[PDB]
Symmetry: C3
């Protein structure tokens, strides 16, 4: 709500951040995996590599590259050993492998493969920086403009506008032309100190954000700061903005500097390599390559030059891109940013979002969608206390009407109908046609050839799985495998299919079942993503298959019980969506009642064999 | 022929079964493989897994899942070891891997990979049950109706009919409409105690059988029994019948309960999991999951409840599905079945077929095809003695005209012409059109674009392979690789191609040759099935390539010398068939003379480079 | 130039060959790789196999099958070990595996996988035979006709013709009809003792050569000799010629006899297996198979019979095919060949080419292309001394106008335009149409849909890589991955894509980058060939991607600085070509200036995002 001053603000959010930090530490430290089989290999960069599947857990799918794992050998055929490695490969399903690069090559027990132990190393950095942002916001009233200060504290302040900021032409150099709503967004943002943009799925929030940044960077001296709580989003922004022709720098944490990515050619730590504007540095880097190492002297000099270079590139950049937490990087403190844009601001806890904000924001743009998944908070006490409400949402409650991008370009209209109607008051418009959203070289028989989606009615008993903690449904699993197979045969590719289901029992089971009972080859099914809706947020697929799993009426979790998660689940697909489930178990929740009704009205609630589908006469509600 | 009484019957068949059992034991025990390299892994169900290729043998392709292997370590870098595992993965060609799950995790020598030894464990169960069926049929004259008793013993008994059994509508709930011949079949079966149905390839014997079972189950109290000598056929029946909406139970041997399959969600051992109708059982299963094991008490109770549940589900089922031998399961003895349907009854020795029959058959339906492969009998003395004649064939000889399903739905008409004319007196009709049997997204140049088949004339010397026991033909192999490659490039997929050849030398050679000399990637060629015609019986592929191998006139084996096997070989393909061979070596057998003549008459006997084919003027006969 | 006699010739070329031999020995022996991880396996032929990647080198891509490697274990978990194996699998990129078959199975350290060492074994055979050819040519004036003697020594000799050698019909049995220029070539060759044929890429030099050989073999008694410096070319000739219906024998070195190949069914060592014309030999081979080995006696007899057989098949063949060096095989000495055809004669040093020539050539045909890559000479002193000039080129200089095949059948006309204009004075004609060269099932948006090619303008900093010795360009790499991915998604296959780049730093980097940052699956990117232009010479791909790498003006290497290499690079593709590069760095070399100008004139010099390409206004030259 409202706060009297930044100190009260800090007094409320600090403790929340602490709860969350301690809980997160406990949880991360409780995820040790016991009996791991490891496959050793050699990277082309000469570093030793370890591949290993964690059976008995799905959680390793939440790893980002650069996260560090502690690998120990707890056997008796070799000297007890312990080493740390950084993640270079993150698994896509329950049976997929993690791949890490060790910090030092030897004496890694490369001749033993079994009885290894995997721990996830917990770092307090993110939480430390969140706290630092809160303390800064409290003690330093010049960390944001007076206007934004008042607005953040929920004070009453007359609205304010800036005239004469609009460009002759809105479309940025190198980007598509913007549609009506996108232009209106850019325009409104250029006229205001604080703006909220709502970007529903498929609407081009990235292009719009890149345009905004383009214009802000052209009418400003210092770098524009661009953030997001996830590295994926940040990389996307970085790429569009870069296509703009601006001088863009992608700042990575030092933990993530041995890692490549779609946009690492813009990474700070790569840009300072082989610079002609710093011959001495060249001379040293060269000598750290030809020879193995550098003397103490040459090393100290080397580091000094690296620091100089980093300062130079950061200070002279048009745009700096990094994660919200990344903005707390020491190399960025002692810098100020007038214009800050934060994407996916609805997926970050407020403090996390404040990390970059306290770096001198005078013109702030928050892009997001409060109709989709919000912040993920581990500590239920913390969440219930308020840490689960994004800065976006809180500002919306305080009276700021977000500007919504209206035309969607991702999915076949048939697929956008329901989400549009239920979550966006029917406002979304289709920028692609049915013909545009039909896959080339694809023979698949939809019960309604014009509507690439259906609810496969499936009634089978559920079982308790995951040693008492979860559920599986063999019947639904079988139907999911049948559908998947039919899709692959129709010309689809594993990398373009996605299976969403809330229960780890069903995911583990699906992986095993397809691996040993699938019509086609194991290798095919292994490249298919299987996860809870959380994992798919922010990404798209050609085809999405849902599995609801539950046979009897129930409380529900995941998309079964959360409208936002259902929205996400229903809006990931370009070409086709198939929901495998039991209408009798779902219809108790009003939203699923709406979904089922809509699907039957479209003659697309079905049962029977895949080869010969028929409309279900099923009774529910 | 005829038998005076069931005791004479038993006196004749018993000894046969014994010969076969002893021979089979000797053979299975003689298949030990010496120097095996093993790859260790962990299943998601925490069980230890071993992958291994058997080079030097092809026989492991006859393994069914659940069959058990004895794995020993015969090296010196670890304590000599011996463990038993069940098959979870069966190989598709000479170089493919077997995968087994060990019975106990440790202390498996997981750190050694070489000099392992593989044995196939022989169980007498099947033969024991065959014998038990014969003894039962001898001592118990209430094991079958009087009518079927007389009919089986080959006695003269006036034909008999049942009026008023026909349904208002023949088509079953959830299944396609039946064609004329299928309806006639269902109808005739509902009017008779004993019926034989002949289902030529592509004719819908599974749909027809499911319809028959549907109706029999609706006009009866107890479960209908549905069997077949192979798990694949049984699974197919189970699926259609299940699509009917009936209460179906798939009974698996206890050896096959850790194994998933296309239809395991209907498996007895899965249906008795998490039953709300038996809360106590739930409570125990839950506790065997959360905790590791159960106390002695809880375990005894647990087993008792499992038995109760199994009895309940079996007694209250509409249909019970299992293999012929599976019907000898103890859980099924003490039950009676009036209506019994046996599919692939022509592929089982009579005793094997009698196993389910002696469970009280009063209305018996035998589906099969005596124009295809019959029973496989190892002991030549036994076979020659009569064990190679199915119950189907013997009944046919005794004067029962089988009812033939007439319209085929699998293959392009061009492909059905010859088999139809030669093996089915030209009766088969085409239920699919040429346009229906043209692959989507497929550029391949057939010498006759309208007829997707040809005989590639190939004259190259043969060599002796497989250490003196077999043959190979490098020339033919090269042409087979060329064709395979051309198919893959044309858009076909490895899983949809099949290579049939009678000689193991040629199969081993083909695998090696494609692995190290194939135009494309190894991974592609590795997923291609290469086998004798036997392995393909009952299954279909998009494309079938034959290799005849023999260069000089010869005795012949496999499809070279057996009309039934040739029928099978020629009827596996949906879209295309290519026979690579030497007409001069084949034309000595009259059937191949017919085939070659027909192929030349269709302007489809060819030679020359694939890219530029031409009609062969070759002279033979 | 000119030589007074064969002794002066020998005196000049001998020393060159020696320089090259010594240099080559030093180089090969300097390529030992230190810390190799090995994967052990078993071939179906029971031989022990080792797979291993050489990170830190690309050179293993120049291995031919049969080349031998020395594998040593330099660890401490097993007895120090050393074994020799022959190459059965050659890598396609920086991270791909070599696979070798050991000479003796045990006691290979199969239980250790790390700290292995790989050496390339150097054999002097090739150079020995080159020297022997030079000595023979010097001392023996009956080693070639008087005419060819004079012509080779560069003496003035009146031209000479042979009347009445032309066939009623030029087209050979089993081959396509020849076009105008091909017929003219065949015709001119049949009328002359010495002929040079120039075959630009895509023109059917193989079909034409097979036709020539066909006719020469029909109007002659002894075998025609057919050679080429590479096994691939030789195999191609062997195949066409074989399609002719002639008795063809492919001679392989004894080192390459355990290796299969596209045309090994014609290999001498396979043809002498199971010969009915030599029953005794049969009897022995059989007995070396059934039993393990042969007694001393049976072995001596066995070898004698093998020799007899080889002599027979070689003497009675219509055509003998082997590599240039292969013609120095002892089994061929003591034979004479009147008609000799040498393909790719422009890719072999003159001595190498002379190896087969000195076997009695009276009618000699040299096929090649001096506008493409010439001989690869390691010793710069040797090369500069003259060893880099092929016999073809030297003869051309001496006044022989090569006969050029004019119509090209490989590439879309759009792709042939530039190479044709710049390297072949515009003479090349298109035998395929644009419609013929559009891939089936391929949705890819070319900036000019009618011209499947473009120059992607890319400006990013370069870095020094490969420990000081090479370069990489992260920006260009990123664009190459984007393009590759777009191609794969469009329906292309990894085996049909090729990436050419001159720098090993960029190749290693590309492999790593795609392996860990590629949009699709690792397995996909791993099957993509990445190499310098050298590796692609003689082979074709559906799509070729160039990477120029250099950001600043420079000396240049590979296709950057060699017109012939650029020709090759630009003429490998059937369907599409994309050059990723910086026009400012390239335009300094006149040829690249021409290329860039042409590309802009076709509205196909572009920049911007792939999804939304735009014409570059870039200024250069």
């Amino acid at each position: 709500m409202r706060y009297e001053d930044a100190y009260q603000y800090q007094n409320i959010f600090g403790p929340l951040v602490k709860l969350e930090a301690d809980y997160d530490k406990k949880l991360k430290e409780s995820q040790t995996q016991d009996n791991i089989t490891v496959r050793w290999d050699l990277g082309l960069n000469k570093k030793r590599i370890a591949y290993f599947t964690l059976p008995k857990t799905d959680s390793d799918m939440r790893l980002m590259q650069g996260d560090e794992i502690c690998l120990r050998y707890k056997g008796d055929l070799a000297p007890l050993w312990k080493g740390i490695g950084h993640v270079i490969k993150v698994p896509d399903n329950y049976g997929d492998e993690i791949a890490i690069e060790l910090r030092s090559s030897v004496g890694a027990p490369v001749e033993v493969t079994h009885n290894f132990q995997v721990d996830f190393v917990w770092k307090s950095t993110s939480f430390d920086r969140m706290q630092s942002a809160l303390k800064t916001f409290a003690v330093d009233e010049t960390s944001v403009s007076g206007y934004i200060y008042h607005k953040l504290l929920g004070h009453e302040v007359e609205d304010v506008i800036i005239k004469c900021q609009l460009p002759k032409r809105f479309t940025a150099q190198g980007l598509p032309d913007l549609n009506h709503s996108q232009v209106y967004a850019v325009k409104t943002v250029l006229q205001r100190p604080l703006s909220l943009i709502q970007g529903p799925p498929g609407t081009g929030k990235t292009v719009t954000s890149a345009t905004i940044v383009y214009h802000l960077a052209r009418q400003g001296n210092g770098p524009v700061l661009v953030c997001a709580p996830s590295n994926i989003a940040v990389d996307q922004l970085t790429e569009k903005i870069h296509q703009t022709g601006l001088k863009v720098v992608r700042l990575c944490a030092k933990s993530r500097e041995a890692i490549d990515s779609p946009v690492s050619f813009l990474a700070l730590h790569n840009q300072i390599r082989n610079m002609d504007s710093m011959p001495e540095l060249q001379k040293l880097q060269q000598l750290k390559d030809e020879t193995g190492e550098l003397s103490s002297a040459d090393e100290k000099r080397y580091r000094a030059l690296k620091r100089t270079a980093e300062r130079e590139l950061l200070m002279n950049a048009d745009v700096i891109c990094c994660t919200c937490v990344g903005a707390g990087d020491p190399r960025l403190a002692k810098m100020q940013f007038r214009s800050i844009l934060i994407d996916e601001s609805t997926q970050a806890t407020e403090p996390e979002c404040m990390v970059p904000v306290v770096l001198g924001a005078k013109q702030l743009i928050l892009v997001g969608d409060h109709c989709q998944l919000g912040p993920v908070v581990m500590c239920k006490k913390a969440a219930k206390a308020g840490l689960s409400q994004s800065l976006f949402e809180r500002l919306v409650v305080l009276g700021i009407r977000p500007i919504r991008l209206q035309v969607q370009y991702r999915m076949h209209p048939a697929l956008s109908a329901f989400p549009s109607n239920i979550f966006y008051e029917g406002s979304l418009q289709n920028g692609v046609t049915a013909a545009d959203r039909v896959k080339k070289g694809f023979d698949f028989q939809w019960p309604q050839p014009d509507k690439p989606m259906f609810f496969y009615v499936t009634q089978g008993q559920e079982e308790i799985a995951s040693s008492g903690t979860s559920y599986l449904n063999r019947t639904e699993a079988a139907n999911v495998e049948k559908i998947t197979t039919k899709l692959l045969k129709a010309g689809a590719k594993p990398d373009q299919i996605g299976i969403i289901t809330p229960y780890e029992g069903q995911r583990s089971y699906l992986v095993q079942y397809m691996q040993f009972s699938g019509s086609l080859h194991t290798k095919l099914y292994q490249e298919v993503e299987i996860a809870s809706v959380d994992a798919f947020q922010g990404r798209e697929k050609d085809f999405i298959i849902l599995s609801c799993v539950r046979a009897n009426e129930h409380q529900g979790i995941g998309f079964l019980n959360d409208p936002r998660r259902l929205n996400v689940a229903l809006t990931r697909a370009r070409y086709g969506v198939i929901i495998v489930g039991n209408p009798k178990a779902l219809s108790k929740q009003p939203l699923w009642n709406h979904l089922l009704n809509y699907y039957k009205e479209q003659k697309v609630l079905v049962e029977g064999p895949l080869n010969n589908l028929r409309e279900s006469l099923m009774q529910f509600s």
